[PDB]
């Protein structure tokens, strides 16, 4: 069960801007009302 698909149209790649996306909590400590570098 393994196929090579077809009926696919050609197109160049597309790009977009990330408006301040992709930030995560860098530890498991609780912090409140602060600015941390």
């Amino acid at each position: 069960q393994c196929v090579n698909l077809t009926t696919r149209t050609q197109l160049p790649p597309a790009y977009t801007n990330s408006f301040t996306r992709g930030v995560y909590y860098p530890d498991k400590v609780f912090r409140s009302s602060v600015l941390h570098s």
């Binding site: 400590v29 609780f30 912090r31």
Partner: protein, 50 residues
């Protein structure tokens, strides 16, 4: 949980996310902790003052 210290423990209003156990202030000292048996948050305040 192995973290030793001295101070006064009081009931807290902070509310931890499930993956958090300790809370730290700007001087990086532990000022809040989740009790590992009752799952309640406590504030730790130093003892000397004045």
């Amino acid at each position: 949980n192995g973290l030793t210290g001295t101070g006064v423990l009081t009931e807290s209003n902070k509310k931890f996310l499930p993956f958090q156990q300790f809370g730290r202030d700007i001087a990086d000292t532990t000022d809040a902790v989740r009790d590992p048996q009752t799952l309640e948050i406590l504030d730790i305040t130093p003892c000397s003052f004045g």
